[PDB]
Design a protein around this ligand. Structure first.
Ligand SMILES: CC(C)[C@H](Nc1ncnc2[nH]c(-c3cnn(CC(=O)N(C)C)c3)cc12)c1ccc2c(c1)OCCO2
Length: 168
């Protein structure tokens, strides 16, 4: 049903809210929820661990069967699988992990995957323990994504800093 509410409108197609992406998926019932994935789809930590636990491990079981036959994703790449009880589909997107020396330039490629979907509920790619500058990830999102993206950022201090810096 894609019933998003309580978002700040940053541009004509990018919205942001201080919220847990899991609670937003349960309220909104989106067509697509984006996972902040890694190349072997190991759903531990951050967004991935929270989405997988909210599916009672159904996401991990499906992802392990996908990887057994198809192998790992590339950094900047994505994979549509089931959204289970959270969404119709889950778009698993791998942003670069700059704390592990991956190329920050691939963050644009990671957000370009969003353009295949009319509307998405998504996290801020490559933030948290992946190490990218959040203000930079928000600018790449705004400059790259043309479809409707609703960003859920589960940290009030980070949310306030992003909004204040975007509005300068
Ligand atoms: C930057 C941060 C704030 C962001 N995290 C998040 N952004 C949006 N919704 C989120 N939910 C959770 C979460 C975790 N646990 N729970 C359950 C819970 O707290 N319960 C009490 C039941 C919910 C984290 C989260 C982020 C974004 C991208 C990343 C990244 C992290 O980790 C590495 C890859 O990429």
């Amino acid at each position: 049903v894609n019933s998003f509410s309580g978002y700040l409108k940053l541009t004509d197609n990018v919205y942001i809210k201080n919220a847990d992406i899991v609670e937003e998926a349960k309220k909104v019932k989106p067509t697509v929820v984006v996972n902040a994935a890694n190349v072997y789809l190991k759903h531990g930590g951050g967004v991935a661990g929270a989405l997988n636990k909210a599916t009672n491990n159904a996401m991990q079981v499906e992802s392990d069967d996908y990887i057994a036959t198809n192998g790992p994703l590339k950094v900047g790449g994505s994979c549509v699988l089931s959204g289970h009880n959270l969404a119709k589909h889950c778009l698993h997107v791998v942003g670069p992990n700059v704390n592990k020396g991956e190329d920050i330039q691939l963050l644009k490629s990671a957000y370009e995957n969003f353009n295949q979907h009319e509307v998405l509920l998504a996290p801020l790619l490559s933030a948290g323990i992946f190490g990218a500058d959040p203000i930079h990830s928000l600018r790449v999102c705004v400059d790259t994504v043309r479809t409707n993206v609703y960003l859920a950022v589960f940290d009030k201090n980070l949310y306030d800093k992003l909004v204040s810096s975007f509005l300068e």
